[PDB]
Amino acid sequence: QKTYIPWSNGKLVVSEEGRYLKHENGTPFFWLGETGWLLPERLNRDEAEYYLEQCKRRGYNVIQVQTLNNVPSMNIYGQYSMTDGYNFKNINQKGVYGYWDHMDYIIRTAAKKGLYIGMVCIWGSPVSHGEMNVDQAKAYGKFLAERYKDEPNIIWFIGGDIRGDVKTAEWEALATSIKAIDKNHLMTFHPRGRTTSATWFNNAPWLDFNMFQSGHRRYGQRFGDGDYPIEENTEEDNWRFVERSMAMKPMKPVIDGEPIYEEIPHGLHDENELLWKDYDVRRYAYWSVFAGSFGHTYGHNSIMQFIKPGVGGAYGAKKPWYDALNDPGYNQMKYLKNLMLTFPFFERVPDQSVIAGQNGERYDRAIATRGNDYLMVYNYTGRPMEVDFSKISGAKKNAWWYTTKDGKLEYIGEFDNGVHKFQHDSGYSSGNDHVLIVVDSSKDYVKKDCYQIDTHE
Ligand SMILES: [N]
Ligand SMILES: [N]
Ligand SMILES: [N]
Ligand SMILES: [N]
Ligand SMILES: [N]
Ligand SMILES: [N]
Ligand SMILES: [N]
Ligand SMILES: [N]
């Protein structure tokens, strides 16, 4: 059965409303990201093929990597990413399978499977430690853009766990050098924990969409005093990054490029802290999207560092990457993508006024989104809610429950056009999160006889 190739619909473009990505032919692109940070540095050819194929099988269509993690970077074969500093003229050597030949392979294997590579050009650490100045950045961006501009399946990531006000001149030079040559790919900036690219780069012409990092601290988790880029006790409210990014004008799309990671300890500093679980992963995913993000990126502690036996992880990871492929949150992100692709895509907005009466706080805060003829409410705890059906068209509505851990659908019934009270039959605050789906009765986006929403690719 012919593998879906996203870019058969054309190159990626910011849609006219300023909220979503599409292909040139009008087709929605629902970004479902996986975090393969150390893919170029730690996997060999067979391993990379296996990783990429296992990601495809689970609906991911963007794989975020660190193209470089040091200056120079090393790969599993013992090849340097630079053999003469930032002079790239003799980087290809006849009869040597180099760092960049393996990068090429990863990109082209991904292309065969219909996956984009989210290329973090160079992670923030070496840059803030002085290892790429302004001239080095121009020479590197030029090298990247000339090598990869005609590869169909690239999205460029400037930054890498770094604030936009650190080494700004170096990041601008990298970004502008790439954009002077490569007119075929989009670009973003991946920022520091608890920050959004919008703060520094919303108005930057090289930046097509914004990205934030909501990971990896719990409510109230401080490790001393500094200036703190968020209000106290809002760490887990990743919907706040969405509202703050999209309030900046002109409006551009936004995504959580690094939420919490599955099995990573709360806050990263203590190896023995509570681990983030599947239910947390889902919460961050639905909260970001229902707040207005154009898609979501997922990660897992073990997969992102490609943990193997003999190579202990940061953040107390022991489980190999290849066994983390069976963990639950990794296997549940497809149900989000399949959901969002089931309904009219470009007219979707966030709308908390869909939720009437008194709303909960923290985890009990129900979150809603709608088109013109459908609405969706994500309830994490199961706390009773009131939903105003008059915010969408239709004199009668149909309603369903969608459970997010398995994509199952349960038809509720027909309803007139007022406020209505809803409460899912499941354990309260038990990680049995659910979406209330409500559709104008005249439309047929979901049938009444469906047990589940099928795969949209
Ligand atoms: N999107
Ligand atoms: N690698
Ligand atoms: N190099
Ligand atoms: N690589
Ligand atoms: N977005
Ligand atoms: N991520
Ligand atoms: N949005
Ligand atoms: N990941």
SS3 content of the chain, % helix, strand, coil (to 5): 30, 20, 50
3-state secondary structure of 32: strand
Distance 59 CA to ligand 1 centre (A): 15
Domains and CATH numbers, the chain: 1-235 (3.20.20.80), 236-457 (no CATH)
140 lines ligand 3 (CB under 6 A): no
Distance 251 CA to ligand 7 centre (A): 10
CB within 6 Å of ligand 2 — which residues? 40-43, 75-76, 102
Residue 279: closest CA among 321, 327, 233: 327
What is the structure's resolution, reported in angstroms to one decimal? 2.3
The DSSP secondary structure of 48-101, one letter per residue, reads: HHHHHHHHHTTT--EEEEES-SSSS-B-TT--BS-SBTB--TT-S-TT---HHH
Judged by its nearest atom, the ligand closest to the C-alpha of residue 293 is 5
Assigned token pair, 292: 């207005």
Tokens 């520091």: give the residue: 192
Q: Are 305 and 37 in contact (CB under 8 A)?
A: yes
Distance 102 CA to ligand 4 centre (A): 5
In angstroms, the CA 185 to CA 136 distance is 22
Judged by its nearest atom, the ligand closest to the C-alpha of residue 35 is 8
In angstroms, the CA 155 to CA 294 distance is 15
Rounded to 5 degrees, φ, ψ at 39 are: -60, -50
3-state secondary structure of 136: helix
Tokens 């936009």: give the residue: 164
193 lines ligand 4 (CB under 6 A): no
The secondary element (H helix, E strand) that includes residue 138 is helix 134-148
Residue 373: closest CA among 397, 356, 351: 397
| Total residue length of the chain | 457
19 lines ligand 5 (CB under 6 A): yes
82 lines ligand 8 (CB under 6 A): no
Task: Describe the strand order of the beta sheet including 374-379 as a list of residue ranges.
Answer: 349-350, 367-370, 374-379, 434-440, 397-403, 408-415
259 lines ligand 7 (CB under 6 A): no
In angstroms, the CA 433 to CA 200 distance is 35
Distance 22 CA to ligand 1 centre (A): 6
In angstroms, the CA 443 to CA 272 distance is 51
Query: What b/e readout covers 215-252, taking b as 16+ CB neighbours within 10 angstroms?
Result: bbbbeeeeeeeeeeebeeebbbbbbbbbebbbebeebb
254 lines ligand 5 (CB under 6 A): yes
In angstroms, the CA 91 to CA 144 distance is 12
Distance 20 CA to ligand 8 centre (A): 23
Q: Are 376 and 284 in contact (CB under 8 A)?
A: no
- For the four alpha carbons of 342, 343, 347 and 348, in that order, the dihedral sign comes to negative
Assigned token pair, 124: 């923030």
Distance 394 CA to ligand 6 centre (A): 40
Q: Are 204 and 252 in contact (CB under 8 A)?
A: no
